[PDB]
Specification:
The structure is cut from a larger assembly and holds 2 copies of chain A.
Chain A (H helix, E strand, L loop, with lengths): L12 H18 L26 H20 L11 H4 L29 H25 L2 E2 L9 E2 L10 H21 L27 E2 L10 E7 L7 E5 L15 E5 L4 E3 L3 E3 L9 E7 L4 E6 L2 E2 L20 E4 L1
Parallel strand pairs in A: 1-2
Antiparallel strand pairs in A: 3-12, 4-9, 5-6, 5-12, 6-7, 7-8, 9-10, 10-11
Helix pairs in contact in A: 1-2, 4-5
The structure holds adenosine-5'-triphosphate and ligand KVR.
The ligand COc1ccc2c(c1)CN(Cc1ccc(C(=O)O)cc1)CCS2 binds next to loops of chain A.
PDB class: membrane protein
Keywords: calcium channel, membrane protein
Entry title: Structure of PKA phosphorylated human RyR2-R2474S in the closed state in the presence of ARM210
């Protein structure tokens, strides 16, 4: 809906059209293919370098439309591309090019010195987005055609092996498309229209995409195992690192309420290095993958302690007591969230 | 005001502006940045999940403000009067709040030039202190310069270098002209530390903290300079003979630090120290300045050591080991044991504070039955009637 044609590119649409034609033909010929008599899969030859009689006009239209879609996508990314200097045509100079690599079609190749251009990581990021978006557009076009994913190419059932999200795509094809499009972007930079593009700052994402009924699961010992006197110990190994709490809970602790948000639980949270009982206070350290937290309770003196990998965790003060005052009540049981 | 101080304008009209600045603008800056320091230090990493990260232009403005305050405070503490503490505290807090990484990656050329010029001015002021303090003790410009240095330059540089070392911004900041300016600063700090003069032992400490912070902050192993080629971030390995010729260098790897001896030489010095049994008063500079520098150097350069890097262990600039650490700390507690009975001062406590990083670094297996002497001496000497620590 937001797409508009950029205000200085009206008269240059033609030149960009034949320019994209030039990139298309040079990319096709220097991807390893060459002009041949007949089309075969094993031949790896491109016979379509012939007069426009048979050459697919639909392929020409596809080339033009993907070029315009590419430029529209860069403008949609926020790239208010700027015209720098006409001197690109003057600066570009023909290097040594072999006779075989010289195109027999009659047009003069223009391979420029693309090594010295330093690709800033921002344009690398826009290149990643261009690859993702082009792959998505191709997948959408195939789905509109009726293609569906399969293990291998089946023309009869219209099963395509490559119809997967680009993040999970195979290395070879994504590398090929990625190099084709970096060549396209680098040729645009060679003509010199600089990418006044924005930077995508890091955005916080809650990451909570589980079932809406549960943001956490609480595991506890049975009520009948509640201990009301003595010195008790247990362990909690964290296979991963993240939102996890471990500690002691009252028999009446609710399962749908987060540990330590009320009076019914005393917990330690190593994701944010805090202790939880009726609130939040900083305590201890932050665990990692494979860390073992040892929880100790002493009901004789009404105290609680936590150790990370053997070392005793301590709060802002020098005390090792995570919780030092609580009524015994109906006892405590091991619990985690 | 400085242009027309001695002229017809002995009473500057802008008393309202000066008072408003010195009474509101500075303390407001100090308190605001102290409260919101985490906002400006935020980056791609997310320490403060709730609050957002400061913009790149925001950090550029913070750096510009720090540079402008430095330019203001240069050689004008006496004119500021009692506010000089306020300006230097503002510079301190701003130096903590700076984000050199992002500023260098995406920053205005004016801001980068301002930071480079601030560091170069610090080096030039240190060199002026050199030239006047040498054969100036007999004799005002010299007094004003030395007061400005001892009041602002040491705290400012110490705080900035501590921040740089703590956030590993040296690899992103100290390069080319910045790096040669830091070389000049290092030579100056070492010369002030080594030299003996009444003005020197009157401010030995602040030189100690500044030089230790610099040792922590500097991204090149200046002590073990013989392994120069291994370091990739050195000017001697990056930008080559053409720029040796373009901008002046000592041009020799071992001559880059003429007054700074080699790491092994300082190690031998501290080993026969307290074993030759020389008096504290003869040459007090080692245990007050050099040992802090050694501790900061080792604390910064442990992880690059060969024993921490079995991979490409031949491709490391520094060659520190846990045996180096325990030998140096052994020399430390030998010195304190032989010097606790006489020449009592707070410098033992300051040295212990400075060596706290190395005792944290050292593995606890050595703590077992090696620091047992440390605890038993520390308790038997504290067994006196008045308890401490
Ligand atoms: N009309 C077109 N002409 C040429 N190439 C195209 C066209 N449409 C898409 N392409 C791109 O060419 C690549 C494959 O080349 P080819 O033209 O042989 O495949 P295709 O005929 O487009 O079949 P598919 O749509 O399954 O890729 C695809 O990655 C696709 O993105
Ligand atoms: C199927 O006839 C065509 C029609 C058009 C074009 C080509 C071949 C040549 N191609 C190379 C190519 C071919 C097949 C795939 C593939 O789908 O595996 C990928 C790239 C570039 C686009 S012009």
């Amino acid at each position: 809906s937001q797409i508009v044609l950029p205000p200085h590119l009206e008269r240059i649409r033609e030149k960009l059209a034949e320019n994209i034609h030039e990139l298309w033909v040079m990319n096709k010929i220097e991807l390893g293919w060459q002009y041949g008599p007949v089309r075969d899969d094993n031949k790896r030859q491109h016979p379509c370098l012939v007069e426009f009689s048979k050459l697919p006009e639909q392929e020409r239209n596809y080339n033009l439309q993907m070029s315009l879609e590419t430029l529209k996508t860069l403008l949609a990314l926020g790239c208010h591309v700027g015209i720098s200097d006409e001197h690109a045509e003057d600066k570009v100079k023909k290097m040594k090019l072999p006779k075989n690599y010289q195109l027999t079609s009659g047009y003069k190749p223009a391979p420029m010195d693309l090594s010295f251009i330093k690709l800033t990581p921002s344009q690398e990021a826009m290149v990643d987005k261009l690859a993702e978006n082009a792959h998505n557009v191709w997948a959408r076009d195939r789905i509109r055609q009726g293609w569906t994913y399969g293990i291998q190419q089946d023309v009869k059932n219209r099963r395509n092996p490559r119809l997967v999200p680009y993040t999970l795509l195979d290395d070879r094809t994504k590398k090929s498309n990625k190099d084709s499009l970096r060549e396209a972007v680098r040729t645009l930079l060679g003509y010199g229209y600089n990418l006044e593009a924005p930077d995508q700052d890091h955005a916080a994402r809650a990451e909570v995409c589980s079932g809406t009924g549960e943001r956490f699961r609480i595991f506890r010992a049975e009520k009948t195992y509640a201990v009301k006197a003595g010195r008790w110990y247990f362990e909690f190994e964290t296979v991963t690192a993240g939102d996890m709490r471990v500690g002691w809970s009252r028999p009446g602790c609710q399962p749908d309420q987060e540990l330590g948000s009320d009076e019914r639980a005393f917990a330690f949270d190593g994701f944010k290095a805090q202790r939880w009982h009726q609130g939040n206070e900083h305590y201890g350290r932050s665990w990692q993958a494979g860390d073992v937290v040892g929880c100790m309770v002493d009901m004789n003196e009404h105290t609680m302690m936590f150790t990370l990998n053997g070392e005793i965790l301590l709060d802002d003060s020098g005390s090792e007591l995570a919780f030092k005052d609580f009524d015994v009540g109906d006892g405590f049981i091991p619990v985690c969230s | 005001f400085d242009g027309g101080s001695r002229g017809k304008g002995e009473h500057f009209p802008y008393e309202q502006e000066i008072k408003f600045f010195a009474k509101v603008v500075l303390p407001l800056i100090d308190q605001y940045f102290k409260n919101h320091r985490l906002y400006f230090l935020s980056a791609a990493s997310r320490p403060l999940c709730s609050g957002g990260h400061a913009s790149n232009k925001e950090k550029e403005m913070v750096t510009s403000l720090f540079c402008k305050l430095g330019v203001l405070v240069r050689h004008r503490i006496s004119l500021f009067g009692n506010d000089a503490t306020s300006i230097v505290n503002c510079l301190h807090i701003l130096g903590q709040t700076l984000d050199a990484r992002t500023v260098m990656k995406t920053g205005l050329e004016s801001v980068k030039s301002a930071l480079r010029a601030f560091l170069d001015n610090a080096a030039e002021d240190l060199e002026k202190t050199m030239e006047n303090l040498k054969q100036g003790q007999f004799t005002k410009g010299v007094t004003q310069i030395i007061n400005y240095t001892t009041v602002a330059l040491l705290p400012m540089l110490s705080s900035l270098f501590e921040h740089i070392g703590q956030h590993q911004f040296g690899e992103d900041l100290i390069l080319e002209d910045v790096q040669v300016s830091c070389y000049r600063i290092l030579t100056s700090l070492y010369a002030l530390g080594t030299s003996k003069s009444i003005y020197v032992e009157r401010q030995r400490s602040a030189l100690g903290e500044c030089l230790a912070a610099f040792a922590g902050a500097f991204p090149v192993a200046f002590l073990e300079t013989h392994l120069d080629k291994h370091n990739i971030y050195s000017i001697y390995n990056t930008k080559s003979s053409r720029e040796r010729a373009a901008l002046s260098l000592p041009t020799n790897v071992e001559d880059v630090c003429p007054n700074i001896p080699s790491l092994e030489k300082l190690m031998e010095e501290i080993v026969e120290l307290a074993e030759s049994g020389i008096r504290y008063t003869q040459m007090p500079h080692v245990m007050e300045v050099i040992l802090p520098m050694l501790c900061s150097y080792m604390s910064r350069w442990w992880e690059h050591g060969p024993e921490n890097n079995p991979e490409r262990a031949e491709m490391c600039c520094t060659a520190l080991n846990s045996e180096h650490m325990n030998t140096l700390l052994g020399n430390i507690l030998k010195i304190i044991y032989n010097n606790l009975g006489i020449d009592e001062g707070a410098w033992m406590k300051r040295l212990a504070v400075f060596s706290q990083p190395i005792i944290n670094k050292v593995k606890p297996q050595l703590l077992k039955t090696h620091f047992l002497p440390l605890m038993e001496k520390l308790k038997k000497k504290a067994a006196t009637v008045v308890s401490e620590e």
